[PDB]
Amino acid sequence: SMLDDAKARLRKYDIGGKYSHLPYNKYSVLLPLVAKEGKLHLLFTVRSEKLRRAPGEVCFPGGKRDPTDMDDAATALREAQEEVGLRPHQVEVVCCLVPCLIDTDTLITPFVGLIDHNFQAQPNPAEVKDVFLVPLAYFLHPQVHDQINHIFEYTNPEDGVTYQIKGMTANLAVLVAFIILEKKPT
């Protein structure tokens, strides 16, 4: 099926816990896959304007590891729960993709999670100003603006709202799209 096929593809790129004991400042992000209307979508947040890091920016759910987290995946789930109400039984963590090195002292580990069809985002306004889906296929033929560096613009056809997606977030979205959608029959 569509979902089993996605998980089978994602597993081939799983690095596991290989880079997890390294002594960095550690953050995790969840790349949440949602199936609507026969297609895969990614769930994104727009960070609250109030926040320390990256106010107002499109990001995946995630944040800093803390001492309660059993591992790096748990960081991602905890933070996703706090930001959009995603509960443990509503997500299956399928793999750990390549970490992202930032600022010489920081490692951000991304996990891809399959999201239950009955989950409905409950944006927490202290963390998140908005939550939106983008079809995964969009990342194969994005609308690119050069700001010099590359920015994606996605317009939700439901309401005409335009979102700007950039940096690590845009990079990880392209990666997931390539992994799951490359070389597929129609």
Ligand SMILES: O=C1CC=CN1c1ccccc1-c1cccc(C(F)(F)F)c1
């Ligand atoms: O400034 C940027 C741009 C993209 C990564 N950084 C970060 C840089 C340093 C530390 C953390 C981060 C970060 C910034 C924002 C959300 C997160 C997250 F992991 F919590 F989601 C992590």
